[PDB]
Structure formats: C-alpha cells, structure tokens
Design a protein around this motif. Structure first.
Motif, mmCIF file in Angstrom:
data_model
loop_
_atom_site.group_PDB
_atom_site.id
_atom_site.type_symbol
_atom_site.label_atom_id
_atom_site.label_comp_id
_atom_site.label_asym_id
_atom_site.label_seq_id
_atom_site.Cartn_x
_atom_site.Cartn_y
_atom_site.Cartn_z
ATOM 1 N N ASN A 149 1.043 -1.067 0.108
ATOM 2 C CA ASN A 149 0.170 -0.069 0.144
ATOM 3 C C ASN A 149 1.012 1.154 -0.122
ATOM 4 O O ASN A 149 0.740 1.917 -0.828
ATOM 5 N N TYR A 150 2.005 1.009 0.856
ATOM 6 C CA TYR A 150 2.943 2.372 0.925
ATOM 7 C C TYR A 150 3.298 2.763 -0.486
ATOM 8 O O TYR A 150 3.862 3.796 -0.609
ATOM 9 N N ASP A 177 0.988 4.262 -2.591
ATOM 10 C CA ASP A 177 0.820 5.642 -2.164
ATOM 11 C C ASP A 177 2.115 6.391 -2.948
ATOM 12 O O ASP A 177 1.848 7.808 -2.961
ATOM 13 N N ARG A 178 3.013 5.996 -3.285
ATOM 14 C CA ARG A 178 4.434 6.364 -3.942
ATOM 15 C C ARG A 178 4.485 6.198 -5.664
ATOM 16 O O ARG A 178 5.562 5.915 -5.868
ATOM 17 N N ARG A 194 -5.113 -1.148 0.579
ATOM 18 C CA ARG A 194 -5.961 -0.560 1.352
ATOM 19 C C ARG A 194 -6.781 -1.297 2.054
ATOM 20 O O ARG A 194 -7.059 -1.582 3.212
#
Ligand SMILES: COc1c(Cl)cccc1Nc1c(-c2ccncc2OC[C@H]2CCCO2)[nH]c2c1C(=O)NCC2
Length: 308
Positions: free
Chosen positions: A131-132, A135-136, A260
């Motif tokens: 997920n991180y 997000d990037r 998510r």
C-alpha cells in the motif's frame, strides 16, 4: 510538472564495514552479512551488502543504481530502507540486516511451529508495505515470499526492487507463476498486478512455502489461467481467507481488492485468528537475545533506530 525527488543518497566507506560472511548467493546476486561502524558515532549497525555475482560490468552498475534510486526514496516499517552505497570496483548496496532470512525459507524451516496470528500478521504487514508503494506511485513487479524478509518473526519487510518502476515494461526474464494474466499476455503491469502477486504470496505462506503449480513448466501457465483455473485452497485455509486469494486472481483487475482493503480484511481476521486459519495445536506455538548473542554486543544499534 511532476514532483521533484529530493531523497538523500548516502556514500559509505569500505573502511567502515566488516563482511563477516556470505548470507546468500542467488540469481538476485550475492548478499553478505556485515557490521557497519560509522566513524566517531560510537554505534555498530548490523547490515546486509548486495552485489551482482558478475565482476565490474558497466551494465551491472547501471541496474544496481536503479535499485538504489528506488530504495533511496522509500521510508516505511514494512519496506527495506537503503542505508547507502559503497563505490568499490563493483557498486555495493547496504540495508539493515534482516537476521531470520527470507520468509519463504522461514515458513519451510518452521512448518510445524507457526501459528495463525503470525501468518495473518504477515499478510497485513505485506499489504501495508505494498500500500505504501501504491501511495508512492511505485509498482514492485516481483512480490513473492522469497522477496519478503524477517527482521524478527513478528516483523517482515519487502525487498528486491530489481523489476520495480514508477507511475507497460517491454519485458525480459520474469517470474510467470507470481504474475497477473494481463502481465503475461500483454506485459501490462500495475498496482492490481502486484495484488495478484500478493494473492500468490499469501497462498505461498498458507501452504508453509509450497512451490505454486509445482512441476508445471512456465509456458503452460498463460493457457491454464485463460481456462479459468487458479491455485488450490490450502488445507489450513477457511473459505473466508481462500475467497480473498481468489479475489486477487480475478480476470478484471478493477474487481481485485486494493492493498488498502486487504490491510483491513486481514487486520480484522488477526483479532480472532483461529476463526480463519485452522492449524493443528495452533494455540501451543510461540517463537523467539536467547538466540542472537554475537561478539561485542555493547554499542550495537538496529538500523531502524539510527539515521531516521
Ligand atoms: C533491499 O535490498 C538489499 C540491499 Cl540494498 C542490501 C542487502 C540485501 C538486500 N536485500 C535482500 C536480502 C537481505 C536483506 C537483509 N538482510 C539479509 C538479506 O539476505 C538474507 C538471505 C537469505 C536468503 C536470501 O537472502 N535477501 C535478498 C535480498 C534481495 O534483494 N533479493 C532477494 C534475496
């Protein structure tokens, strides 16, 4: 007007290391256990040191520095932070040592001594990492148990940004069995392609490190998945958990769950873990200084606690 990547790249001195031994030699390269002592800092950081098995090629240094570029940006508790690089004959990458090896090895080694709360926690921590990366704007394109490491049995991080890319790649040698359908046929990669990979990663752990499609040559797989076949339900898995895996392996990629959501659904299951994974003597099992104990233990700092 895309965002400017301000990540600091750090350059370290061969003088500050001590390559104690080789941890592993594979297709990824050669990983050495080491201890990094920064000068005047009065701290001793245990490290791993990555280096391709070929001697100084100009092509080898290109590809290492692209892995370095990616990992230089990422800061997350479930993604390997690059501490820096050493500019020797060949370029060497340096991260925190993950002492308990890769997760695939770990589950095979501890088939008979791993509970559900570990398996489910892992599924969470991976989904958190992935997920991180979403997000990037960053697609990993090589998620699998082999490319997940174990800081402690309670803490895993994601590794190998060899095939990683930002925001369709023209392809070379890739692991077919962990790839989505549209990635095999049309070589289109995306966050939801990694979800398929994540699905197979979960199956990997729940089968205590079985080979997916064990003894099926990789050319066949495209033909099988087109015909609506997927991996089987592991024995310890409820329909609940297996249902989540199957949702990762959908033809329509929008219909696949997002990291998510996977974080939430597994997080939920981890609160009552024996409702979701049925394991023989699940209650009894517990895992690990009573092991660790190396040479000079004073002034040793986990990398997590250093630069920050
Ligand atoms: C994050 O990139 C690294 C960087 Cl910058 C520097 C060193 C290692 C890695 N990463 C990897 C380790 C590893 C990490 C930290 N500690 C130890 C380790 O190796 C353990 C051995 C057990 C078998 C397999 O590696 N391992 C693998 C990798 C990898 O990149 N690909 C697959 C294998």
């Amino acid at each position: 007007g895309e965002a400017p990547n301000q990540a600091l790249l750090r350059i370290l001195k061969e003088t500050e290391f001590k390559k104690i031994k080789v941890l592993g030699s594979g297709a990824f390269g050669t990983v050495y256990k080491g201890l990094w002592i920064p000068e005047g800092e009065k701290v001793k950081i245990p490290v791993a040191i990555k280096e391709l098995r070929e001697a100084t090629s100009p092509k080898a240094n290109k590809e290492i520095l692209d892995e370095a570029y990616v990992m230089a940006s990422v800061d997350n508790p479930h993604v390997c932070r690059l501490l820096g690089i050493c500019l020797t004959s060949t370029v060497q990458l340096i991260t925190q040592l993950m002492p308990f090896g890769c997760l695939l090895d770990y589950v095979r080694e501890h088939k008979d001594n791993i509970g559900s709360q570990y398996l489910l926690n892992w599924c969470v921590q991976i989904a958190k990492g992935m997920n991180y990366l979403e997000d990037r704007r960053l697609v990993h394109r090589d998620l699998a148990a082999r490319n997940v490491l174990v800081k402690t049995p309670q803490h895993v991080k994601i590794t190998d940004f060899g095939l990683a890319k930002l925001l369709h790649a023209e392809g070379g040698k890739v692991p077919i069995k962990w790839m989505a359908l549209e990635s095999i046929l049309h070589r289109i990669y995306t966050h939801q392609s990694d979800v398929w990979s994540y699905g197979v990663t979960v199956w990997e752990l729940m089968t205590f490190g079985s080979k997916p499609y064990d003894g099926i040559p990789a050319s066949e797989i495209s033909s099988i998945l087109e015909k609506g076949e997927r991996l089987p339900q592991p024995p310890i898995c409820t329909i609940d958990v297996y249902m989540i895996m199957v949702k990762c392996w959908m033809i329509d990629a929008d219909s696949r769950p997002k990291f998510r959501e996977l974080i939430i659904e597994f997080s939920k299951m981890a609160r009552d873990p024996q409702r979701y994974l049925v394991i023989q003597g699940d209650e009894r099992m517990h895992l690990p200084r009573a092991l660790m104990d190396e040479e000079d233990m004073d002034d040793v700092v986990d990398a997590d606690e250093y630069l920050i």
